[PDB]
Design a protein around this ligand. Sequence first.
Ligand SMILES: [Mn+2]
Ligand SMILES: [Mn+2]
Ligand SMILES: [Mn+2]
Length: 430
Amino acid sequence: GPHMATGQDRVVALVDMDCFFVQVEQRQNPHLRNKPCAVVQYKSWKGGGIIAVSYEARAFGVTRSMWADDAKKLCPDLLLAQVRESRGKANLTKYREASVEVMEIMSRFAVIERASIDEAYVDLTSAVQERLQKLQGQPISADLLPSTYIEGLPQGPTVQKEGMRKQGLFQWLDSLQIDNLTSPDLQLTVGAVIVEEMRAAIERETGFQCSAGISHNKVLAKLACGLNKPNRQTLVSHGSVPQLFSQMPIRKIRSLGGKLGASVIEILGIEYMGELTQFTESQLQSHFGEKNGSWLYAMCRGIEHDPVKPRQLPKTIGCSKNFPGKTALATREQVQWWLLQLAQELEERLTKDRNDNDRVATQLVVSIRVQGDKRLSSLRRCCALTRYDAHKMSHDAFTVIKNCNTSGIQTEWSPPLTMLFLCATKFSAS
DNA sequence: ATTATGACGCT
DNA sequence: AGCGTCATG
Ligand SMILES: [Mn+2]
Ligand SMILES: [Mn+2]
Ligand SMILES: [Mn+2]
């Protein structure tokens, strides 16, 4: 009882931009705004592959990983924006720069961990303590939470979405103990006030809408963020976890959407996250390993300790291109030309990174795939990265992979290469 | 013939 | 170090 640490020490938010690449394109081209539209890379094969979908287009069943020609079958008036192509390959610079815009606004409120191009975690514990000592027991008006959902409410003893949102929020605010500066539910509520302000600032200063989740840790904040998209935020309290998890498929939790989650389901004979509570920590550790087992044991009770890392910048900068089927690289000149294209984009991004962020990469990683290998990477080799020069890094990459060519002929390349990847890593301050 | 990344765990 | 897993704009 008095010693069961309930993992309610922190206030953590996850902010995720709605249909990010689509919003970037809609800001640039007002003709795309408030329309079914999607962002595609390339065009010749099946109209290009969709990587981002506006909510209007999602209503027609358009999804990521769909070919545009097929999406057009579902949504004949779908509008498409194409990713820029530079040096023969997709170039995602516009979206990376847009991401930096959003990350810089978020960093004004608290330290953030960049989790992806369009999302960051926020540790709001200290900002909440500050805002609470500023409020001085004053209760929290529903007017401060105009886009917040309280997960699990309304409950107990109107038929429109906004009406139910407001009913649930009213139930939450009425149950609140606004005099206790250490109540976790109050702390989450103030956290949600701050996140409303953060999201207002992002939209005001960039044009971009986002959603957010507010809870006591990263996994719950991410899950909460997904519950009411687009353009809304969701508070998942510690108390909401049992009901939320009682019907929550195991795969919906970050880290469990793959092989490990499938093995939880098959080994334990369960479907939902809440069913995990019936196993001891040792049982879970026996099946899934010591770390995963401790993590599952705590996570199914709403508890997770992974910190919000103070890291706004990516740890690696990389360039990759697939060469499927008939496009696979089968000559030395081909392989060298594409290594040079990738290296030229890498050099440009690295030089910008050095100027902006006062750091230099020191390791170059070269990864390839060979035709007929089921794995995404067939080979991975590192070498020193001592100079930001594309000709040098492409020669070095070729030097470290050239021994994969089983062709006795030095001109041909066999088996042909279906992917090239260059990645700069191990940054140092300079 | 979803493609282009980026993080992190394992050994 | 190099490999595998997970995430997905
Ligand atoms: Mn998003
Ligand atoms: Mn995201
Ligand atoms: Mn998505």
